[PDB]
Design a protein around this ligand. Structure first.
Ligand SMILES: *[C@@H]1O[C@H](CO)[C@@H](O[C@@H]2O[C@H](CO)[C@@H](O[C@@H]3O[C@H](CO[C@@H]4O[C@H](CO)[C@@H](O)[C@H](O)[C@@H]4O)[C@@H](O)[C@H](O[C@@H]4O[C@H](CO)[C@@H](O)[C@H](O)[C@@H]4O)[C@@H]3O)[C@H](O)[C@H]2NC(C)=O)[C@H](O)[C@H]1NC(C)=O
Ligand SMILES: *[C@@H]1O[C@H](CO)[C@@H](O[C@@H]2O[C@H](CO)[C@@H](O)[C@H](O)[C@H]2NC(C)=O)[C@H](O)[C@H]1NC(C)=O
Ligand SMILES: CC(C)CCC[C@@H](C)[C@H]1CC[C@H]2[C@@H]3CC=C4C[C@@H](O)CC[C@]4(C)[C@H]3CC[C@]12C
Ligand SMILES: *[C@@H]1O[C@H](CO)[C@@H](O)[C@H](O)[C@H]1NC(C)=O
Ligand SMILES: *[C@@H]1O[C@H](CO)[C@@H](O)[C@H](O)[C@H]1NC(C)=O
Length: 1788
């Protein structure tokens, strides 16, 4: 067992090594594949991003100044990387260093101090008292000095105007300006015709200035926009008035220019020519007042000297420069605010007019969002207590509403300032909050009393490695490309070893399939294990899977190799071809791997039971293992031994076992075309008996085989010599019989019997890529010989073969057929086998190699029990020693040759070469004589039987010159006798005949290639049902802003400063019966979301044993209240950070709020740290369970705490100081007061929102607005039915968006066109494989012999292909028109597409014609043609994703590209017409336009034309004195030496075409047609009549026989039946001369004689025939004028007997008498030329050369010695033609 496996592995390794054409590519393909993989990996480095927070944004309701400050500077998500103070629950500032807020505070302080100051009245009273020393004068002067000091202090202690002046003088290199603006505004980290061109050029410079152009995108819809609303309902009018007021709150700069123009002269004269200023300047400079000013200044800067220099200046810095600078600043701000539109309110009567006006303003590039209410009627009723409003804006400023989530999860906070922040800079949230606050003010009455802020939740320290995620999850593709190459190669090898009948030869040699399968398993693992190790080390070195142990991936790759090896072992027993299996294995594996990519997309509702029942394949299990590896690798921890993967390995081993048992079942239930599905002479006892059969029988004989005699075994192959030879071997078991093979029964022991019993079947065994020496060594080792024994056997075989040279012993299987047959028959004798069973030797070999192999078998007659089994008669006569013929399953005759010849055989045959005189002489000499056969210059007679021989020969020799007899001959009876005794309009006729034959071969192909009609049909059906799934990608439905759009979410409410000031009732109403928003309140006004009613429990989740360590780790202050969580250590790439438990610190009290969600109280806890820790730990815990983790929390609220005095002060100040009622003084003061009282906020709420949710911030804003509404409602019946709902619905698409969606949709069109191209490329494949099947000498050349006009044949093929493609064309047309695809089923697009498909077929059917010319193999062009068609289609599709003009002009040669471009332009025009009809216009451009579609049609037409012309062109491509005369009825057989060019001469020698018939050596008949139809079609093409066709067919079917099987498939016939069909074809037209070639090839007796009778009958009618073959018996029995050509020239000509007597050898004699040496001595002394050819017991034979003329004396001596030598039997024969042939070939 072990030595056999050793020989098997050695043979497999030698096969793998001797190729040198497959293993190098096998080992190089994975290198290139993974090199491309490592290159595309190294091109994408991993992106690392530290954890960061985001500043809080301010809404317009929380103050105009903070809103503007949040818009301008901090609107880019700077990611400070540290917790900003804005995220603190107490402070809502972050504008502490902003000089604008400081300046506003100092201005407010100046106002509130000047209103309560009385320095003006005090100074006026002091001046009046001084103008009208004293006692009260001192007190008055002291009061005036104190008042002046207070005014000086008020002018000081502000430090804002100085900084503003410094900044405005510095502003009037790129980083410096940005830093200056950032320090000024906030803290530290065609248009010219509309309005004036000043701010137009300003905004142009802003857009062209080199900085972050994001603030302009937010400031454009702020002062250029315009909002429009519903009809003029009084309530809508009131809310619009409130919105206008909250906009104009910032209009204090509009009426400031008039105030400055009115107040400039007054302050000018007050500072120039006022007595108060002079008195102040005089009192500021004195001898005692200086100390007072120094004491009042408190050591501050700008002492009294600087004050006197600044104020007291009649003519370096005085008040004049300050006045000029303030005037310039006011002028600049007025010119800036001039073109600012603050009246952006326009009412509309209806809704369609609203849409039209919004579009019109969109063309004007000035249009903000628009509010659309849902009023029931324009009545005086305020509100229906439920406000439903929508906000319609442009699509480029609002997030898409067709999707609410990114779909696949991916790390990243999603905080881009422009790409995914349209709800901030677009103005959606601002206007939404403004409208909501206006509604709150108009419903209840409260004005604001509320601030709102938005805070984005931070992200916990991720890294961006999406490439690793997409590569490690798509590992099997590039992991198994090279392994698909390997499995294809190994499948090719296996099926090649199987098809050559090598497995059957190994089985009959005494081997089982188990050891063969095991050896193939090992020889397929070894290279697979090597490649697995190489891929493991190249993946460990590639740095793409770090921290991964090589052992686990190595064992995974090895078990995957094992399961794939057993999978291909299962798949191999289904195919029966080398290239076919090698090509279809890859596509079958792809189709069975496609389930993986099919199931990975629908993982949402996949079950574990479904996963188990679907994991029966190896690719899906490998994909599950790769997903496990990815999930354990992405987190940086890697995969190690930690006890999923084990389930995947278990399923893989179960799959291996299932594949093994399936292989074991299929190898037995369905085998190939060769497997098995589950007058007796004296017995010479001089030698030993080797095999003695006894009672041989089967399911519906006894012969004793001898040792030293070469016995024969003849039969009809139907009743014997076929089942008996199989029962004698180990193929089939016996049935009530016995066979003692060398003293061992067959049924008793079968192993020891096969150890010394060789076999040699008809199919020779010769492994390729190997030498004959390796073959001999392997066979000797398999026999069981030792090393020296095998060497001696190989030396003996090399010495006895005849090729003892290194040129032949070290060469591969490149010898001729004769040498191959000789070596294959010599292999069966290696090993010293005592019993050999040959099978059909010398089938079609030349007579020289036949004599060689005969001498070879004769040299091995030293007791080897040679059992011959062949159909040849002369071979069995010369080789067989004991001829045994059986019939009907029983023994009939047995005995030697001469015994069977003289017992029941016919008498002698006397022939004469060149008739009544000779016949009369023969009748007078012998009474029993008769005339047997007389042919051209030849006659023969029979002598059935003895002194008449001498007298007859004397009379023949004496009267030889009397008649025309030129030479005589005598012969004995051959074994075949005993065998048979015992057991013009012709063009149209050819056209219609071709069409009829083609229709018959196509209609009878229901079981054959019939899939070429329904396979493209189902492919196009799948194409359409897949195209009816992708959304139009151009829809935007109306979505209601509500936070419950997601499945599950976690909210929270953080109550800061619980002092019951204004925050208690707010959170209360937030957590009352109505809940968060409008989910359920006296009904469910939200579709498909019924809320749960019964739930009320304030409990804490069960905490594990983690609070103990928190207790022993006490002193957890507000700063750092939880243990740290590390990040991205060196050389450790971690996607999500991990750290020990205790991340949150304490489980907050969880409670459900009856809205399908649960909230937790976070009062007094660090919000940012807790949120980060909880989020990261929950994401990790959810990802650990293989759930495809989604988002966890979306939003939460934090309530906290942050007037009329300033308004009363402004009113009191405006009442005095020259009050008036003009529109330039009172309006400015009123606006200033309103802006002052519109910035204070009592309480505020901060909404923490996650930017991953597309509609999260707006929904929570609406929720908090509804909560504020329910809290502000007082003295109401119930807050249930008081709620506000917000909607989001963009406007209609314009021409730009329509063009965008028409240009972007080309992806679905190209992907639906590629597949339909692939489906339509299947029709010509059947035509090409049909032409290939009938191209290899089957029907092309045979029809080309006779007059066929091959151009007409090509025309017929073309028209049949057209009419056979018409049917599937309209079939698929009605298929894809049955569906409602308006882009194809319209009345103007159906005929153009139909004709496009028609011309595409017309242009593709000739293109695949020349690919069939040079292709010498059938049933394999299908896959390569489909592959090249797919490649051409892919190239043409990708070539349209771009120099484009010349590209599309030159790429029109491929019809696939033309069809793709036509479909693309057709669907593009359909979409364009649809968009233009939707917009309100019409276009009727015809698709038949020569520029668009119609150039491709004419191109395909002319291309098909030129392809047909060039295919007709390719077909046309633009011996030594051979002299012989063939008269009427002269069978002139022209034989020749091996390699004399007989086929070339026959092709060269072939009016003359129609008068000549040809018979091919190989079978030429259709596999699916009928023989009668074959002969009918051939009679039609021959030129017979249309009415006499049936009679000619019946005559042809009755002449050649086989009438019982005349109506049947020709492919299901046998070899002899095919030969009969071919020789009937050779006479279908009835030519005067017909050329035959090997009429009998592997046939059986009782049928060759029939063909010979038909041949002699057709040549007897005066029609000469020409034939040639290797078997000399056929020509010696049929040919009458032989023509032997040695080298190019006819070396011998004449009759058969004349040539055999002229250059042939002498006669042969056989005498039968233990024995006596005296008889042999007398025989040797009587003839001088006597030679002992063979010496046996009581049977001698001799040969007499150069003694043919003395036959009479020889017969006389024989008759005289019959009584002296006591001879029992005598026989005399002549030399046959084979001796003459081998003599002519020997001396050559
Ligand atoms: C909730 O929990 C988070 C953490 O989980 C807390 O955040 C901690 O507290 C501060 C933020 O609120 C952070 O302090 C900052 O730390 C920066 C780090 O710089 C180094 O710090 C180490 C000490 O860790 C020093 O030895 C080094 O020398 C560095 O200074 C400081 O740079 C930063 O200092 C600021 O610098 C800017 C720019 O120069 C100044 O303008 C500013 O005035 C200030 O000086 C500041 O000290 C702290 O790192 C952060 N994390 C930790 C682990 O403590 C929240 O505070 C918690 N919430 C509440 C309400 O407390
Ligand atoms: C809405 O507000 C705008 C300004 O915020 C008002 O327009 C003012 O009044 C007339 C136009 O109506 C102009 O002459 C003024 O220059 C505008 N600006 C100012 C500051 O007065 C408009 O009147 C308001 N409309 C309603 C219905 O209140
Ligand atoms: C209510 C508040 C927030 C609005 C007023 C903010 C003021 C102080 C800011 C906002 C816009 C700023 C102006 C923007 C444009 C220009 C034009 C430039 O050539 C000179 C500076 C100047 C004139 C800036 C001066 C300061 C400015 C007017
Ligand atoms: C600046 O921050 C300090 C911190 O204590 C605070 O007291 C002060 O009011 C802030 N200034 C503002 C908000 O203008
Ligand atoms: C906008 O699109 C809707 C969608 O059907 C349509 O009903 C409406 O008429 C369109 N309006 C305009 C002005 O095109």
């Amino acid at each position: 067992c072990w030595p056999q496996l050793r020989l098997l592995l050695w043979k497999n390794l030698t096969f793998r090594r001797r190729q040198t054409c497959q293993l190098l590519l096998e080992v190089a393909w994975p290198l290139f594949i993974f090199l491309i993989l490592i290159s595309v990996r190294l091109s994408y480095p991993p992106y690392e991003q530290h954890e960061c927070h985001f500043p809080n944004k301010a809404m317009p309701s929380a103050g105009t100044l903070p809103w503007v400050q949040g818009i301008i500077c901090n609107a880019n998500n700077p990611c400070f990387r540290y917790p900003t103070p804005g995220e603190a629950p107490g402070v809502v500032g972050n504008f502490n260093k902003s000089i604008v807020a400081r300046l506003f505070s100092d201005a407010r302080r100046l106002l509130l101090y000047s209103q309560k100051d009385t320095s003006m009245k005090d100074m006026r009273k002091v001046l009046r008292t001084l103008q009208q020393p004293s006692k009260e004068l001192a007190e008055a002067t002291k009061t005036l000095l104190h008042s002046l000091g207070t005014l000086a202090q008020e002018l000081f202690s502000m430090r804002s105007w100085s900084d503003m002046r410094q900044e405005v003088m510095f502003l009037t290199s790129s980083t410096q300006i940005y830093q200056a603006v950032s320090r000024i505004v906030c803290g530290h980290p065609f248009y010219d015709n509309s309005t004036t061109p000043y701010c137009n050029d300003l905004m142009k410079n802003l857009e062209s200035s080199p900085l972050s152009r994001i603030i302009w995108k937010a400031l454009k819809p702020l002062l250029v926009g315009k909002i429009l609303y519903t009809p003029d309902t009084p309530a809508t009018r009131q809310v619009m008035a409130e919105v206008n007021k909250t906009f104009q709150e910032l209009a204090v700069f509009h009426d400031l220019e008039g105030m400055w123009e009115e107040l400039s002269p007054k302050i000018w004269t007050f500072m120039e020519n006022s007595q108060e200023m002079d008195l102040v300047r005089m009192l500021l400079d004195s001898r005692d007042n200086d100390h007072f000013w120094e004491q009042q200044l408190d050591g501050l800067d700008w002492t009294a000297q600087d004050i006197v220099a600044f104020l007291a200046k009649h003519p370096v810095c005085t008040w004049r420069e300050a006045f000029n600078e303030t005037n310039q600043a006011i002028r600049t701000i007025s010119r800036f605010m001039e073109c600012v539109n603050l009246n952006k309110l326009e009412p509309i009567a209806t809704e369609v007019w609203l849409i039209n006006k919004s579009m019109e303003l969109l063309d004007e590039r000035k249009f903000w969002a628009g509010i659309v209410f849902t009023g029931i009627t324009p009545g005086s009723i305020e509100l229906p207590h439920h406000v439903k409003y929508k906000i319609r804006m442009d699509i480029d400023n609002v997030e898409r509403t067709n999707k609410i989530k990114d779909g696949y999860w991916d790390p990243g906070p999603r905080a881009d300032p422009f790409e995914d922040m349209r709800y901030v800079w677009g103005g959606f949230a601002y206007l939404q909050d403004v409208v909501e606050q206006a509604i709150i003010r108009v419903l209840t009455g409260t004005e604001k009393k509320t601030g709102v802020y938005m805070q984005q939740m931070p992200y916990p320290c991720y890294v961006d490695d999406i490439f690793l995620r997409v590569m490690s999850r798509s590992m099997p593709l590039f992991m198994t490309l090279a392994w698909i190459y390997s499995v294809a190669v190994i499948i090719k090898g296996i099926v090649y070893e199987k098809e050559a009948r090598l497995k059957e030869t190994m089985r009959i040699m005494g081997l089982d399939n188990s050891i063969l399968w095991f050896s193939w398993f090992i020889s397929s693992l070894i290279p697979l294990l090597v490649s697995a190790g190489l891929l493991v080390v190249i993946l460990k070195l590639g740095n793409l899977l770090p921290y991964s142990d090589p052992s686990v991936v190595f064992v995974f790759l090895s078990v995957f190799a094992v399961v794939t090896i057993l999978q291909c072992f299962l798949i191999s027993t289904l195919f029966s071809r080398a290239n076919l299996a090698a090509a279809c294995g890859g596509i079958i594996y792809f189709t069975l791997y496609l389930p993986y990519v099919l199931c990975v997309a629908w993982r949402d509702y996949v079950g574990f039971t479904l996963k188990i029942f679907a994991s029966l394949l190896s690719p899906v299990a490998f994909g599950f293992g790769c997903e496990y590896f990815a999930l354990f690798e992405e987190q940086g921890i890697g995969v190690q031994w930690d006890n999923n993967l084990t389930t995947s390995v278990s399923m893989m081993l179960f799959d291996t076992f299932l594949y093994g048992v399936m292989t074991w079942y299929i190898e037995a239930v369905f085998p190939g075309q060769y497997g098995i599905p589950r007058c007796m002479e004296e017995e010479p006892t001089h030698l030993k008996l080797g095999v003695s059969i006894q009672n041989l029988v089967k399911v519906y004989l006894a012969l004793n085989f001898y040792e030293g005699q070469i016995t024969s075994f003849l039969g009809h192959n139907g009743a014997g010599k076929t089942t008996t030879m199989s029962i004698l071997t180990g193929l089939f078991p016996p049935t009530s019989g016995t066979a003692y093979i060398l003293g061992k029964d067959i049924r008793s022991e079968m192993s020891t019997i096969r150890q010394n019993l060789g076999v040699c079947p008809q199919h020779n065994v010769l492994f390729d890529m190997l030498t004959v020496e390796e073959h001999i060594w392997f066979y000797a080792r398999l026999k069981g010989l030792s090393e020296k024994h095998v060497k001696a056997e190989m030396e003996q075989m090399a010495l006895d073969v005849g090729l003892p040279s290194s040129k032949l012993k070290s060469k591969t299987s490149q010898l001729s057929g004769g040498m191959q047959r000789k070596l294959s028959v010599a292999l069966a004798f290696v090993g010293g086998s005592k019993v050999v069973i040959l099978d059909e030797p010398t089938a079609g070999v030349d007579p020289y190699s036949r004599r060689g192999i005969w001498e070879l078998l004769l040299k091995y007659r030293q007791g080897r029990t040679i059992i011959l089994s062949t159909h040849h008669m002369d071979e069995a006569d010369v080789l067989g020693d004991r001829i045994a013929i059986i019939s009907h399953g029983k023994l009939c005759c047995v005995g030697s040759s001469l015994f069977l010849k003289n017992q029941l055989g016919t008498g002698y045959y006397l022939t004469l070469v060149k008739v009544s005189a000779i016949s009369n002489l023969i009748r007078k000499h012998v009474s029993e004589a008769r005339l047997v056969e007389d042919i051209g210059h030849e006659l023969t007679y029979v002598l059935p039987y003895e002194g008449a021989f001498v007298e007859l020969f004397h009379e023949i020799d004496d009267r030889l010159s009397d008649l025309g007899i030129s030479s005589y001959g005598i012969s004995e009876t051959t074994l075949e006798e005993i065998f048979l005794k015992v057991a013009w309009k012709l063009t149209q006729q050819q056209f219609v005949a071709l069409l009829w034959k083609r229709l018959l071969i196509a209609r009878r192909s229901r079981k054959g290639f019939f899939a070429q009609i329904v396979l493209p049909a189902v492919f196009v059906c799948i194409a359409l049902v897949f195209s009816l799934i992708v959304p139009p990608f151009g829809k935007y439905p109306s979505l209601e802003l509500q936070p419950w759009m997601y499945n599950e979410q976690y909210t929270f409410v953080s109550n800061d400063a619980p002092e019951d000031t204004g925050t208690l009732e707010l959170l209360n109403a937030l957590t009352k019966d109505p809940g968060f928003g409008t989910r359920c309140m006296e009904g469910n006004p939200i579709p498909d979301t019924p809320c749960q009613a019964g739930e009320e429990e304030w409990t804490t989740a069960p905490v594990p044993q983690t609070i103990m360590d928190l207790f022993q780790n006490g002193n957890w202050t507000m700063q750092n209240p939880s243990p740290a969580c590390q990040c991205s250590s060196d050389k450790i790439k971690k996607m999500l950070p991990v750290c020990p438990p205790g991340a949150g610190g304490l489980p907050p009290p969880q409670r459900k709020q009856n809205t399908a969600d649960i909230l937790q109280d976070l009062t007094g806890r660090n919000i940012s740290d807790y949120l980060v820790k909880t989020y990261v730990q929950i994401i990790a815990k959810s990802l650990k369970n293989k759930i495809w983790v989604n988002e966890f929390r979306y939003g939460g609220f934090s309530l906290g705490v942050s007037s009329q005095e300033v308004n009363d002060a402004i009113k009191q100040m405006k009442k005095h100081l020259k009050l008036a009622k003009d529109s330039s003084a009172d309006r400015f003061l009123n606006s200033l007061g309103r802006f002052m009282t519109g910035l204070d906020t009592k309480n505020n709420v901060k909404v923490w929102f996650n930017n991953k949710g597309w509609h999260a911030i707006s929904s929570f804003l609406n929720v908090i607005n509804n909560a504020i509404l329910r809290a502000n409602l007082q003295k109401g019946e119930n807050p249930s039915h008081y709620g506000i709902t917000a909607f989001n619905h963009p406007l209609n698409l314009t021409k730009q968006q329509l063009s965008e969606v028409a240009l972007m949709t080309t992806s679905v069109d190209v992907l639906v066109s590629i597949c339909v191209i692939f489906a339509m490329s299947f029709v010509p494949a059947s035509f090409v494989v049909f032409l290939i099947q009938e191209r290899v000498s089957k029907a092309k050349h045979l029809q080309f012999i006779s007059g066929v006009k091959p151009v007409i044949y090509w025309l017929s093929n073309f028209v049949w292909d057209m009419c056979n493609y018409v049917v599937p064309a309209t079939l698929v047309i009605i298929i894809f028109i049955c569906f409602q695809q308006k882009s194809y089923v319209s009345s103007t697009n159906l005929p153009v597409l139909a004709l496009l498909l028609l011309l595409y077929g017309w242009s593709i059917t000739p293109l695949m014609y020349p690919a069939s010319f040079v292709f010498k193999i059938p049933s394999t062009a299908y896959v390569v043609l489909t592959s090249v068609n797919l490649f051409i289609g892919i190239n043409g599709s990708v070539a349209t994703f771009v120099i484009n003009d010349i590209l599309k002009s030159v790429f029109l040669i491929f019809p696939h590209f033309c069809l793709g471009r036509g479909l693309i332009d057709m669907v593009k025009n359909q979409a364009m017409a649809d968009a233009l009809e939707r917009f309100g216009e019409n276009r009727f451009v015809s698709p038949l336009s020569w520029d668009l579609v119609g150039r491709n049609l004419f191109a395909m037409a002319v291309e098909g034309v030129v392809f047909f012309l060039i295919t007709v062109l390719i077909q046309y491509r633009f011996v030594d004195r051979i002299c012989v005369g063939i008269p009427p009825g002269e069978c002139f057989g022209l034989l020749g030496v091996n390699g004399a060019g007989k086929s070339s001469t026959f092709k060269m020698l072939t009016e003359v075409h129609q008068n000549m018939g040809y018979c091919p050596q190989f079978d030429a008949i259709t596999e699916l047609l009928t023989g009668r139809e074959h002969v009918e079609f051939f009679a039609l093409l021959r030129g017979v009549p249309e009415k006499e066709v049936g009679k000619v067919g019946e005559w042809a079917i009755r002449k050649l026989g086989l009438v019982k099987y005349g109506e049947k498939y020709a492919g299901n016939y046998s070899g002899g039946n095919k030969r009969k069909l071919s020789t009937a074809m050779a006479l279908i037209g009835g030519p005067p001369v017909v050329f035959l070639d090997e009429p009998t090839t592997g046939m059986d007796p009782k049928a060759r004689r029939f063909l010979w009778n038909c041949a002699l009958s057709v040549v007897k009618e005066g029609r000469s025939v020409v034939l040639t073959s290797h078997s000399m018996e056929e020509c010696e029995a049929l040919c009458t004028r032989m023509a032997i050509m040695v080298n190019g020239r006819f070396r011998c000509l004449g009759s058969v007997q004349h040539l055999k007597n002229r250059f042939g050898d002498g006669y042969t004699i056989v005498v039968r008498i233990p024995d006596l040496k005296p008889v042999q001595d007398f025989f040797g002394l009587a003839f001088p030329g006597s030679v002992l050819k063979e010496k046996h017991r009581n049977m001698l034979q001799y040969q007499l050369p150069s003694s043919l003329s003395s036959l009479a004396r020889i017969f006389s001596i024989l008759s005289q010695s019959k009584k002296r030598l006591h001879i029992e039997d005598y026989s005399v024969s002549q030399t046959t033609l084979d001796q003459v042939f081998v003599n002519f070939a020997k001396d050559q």
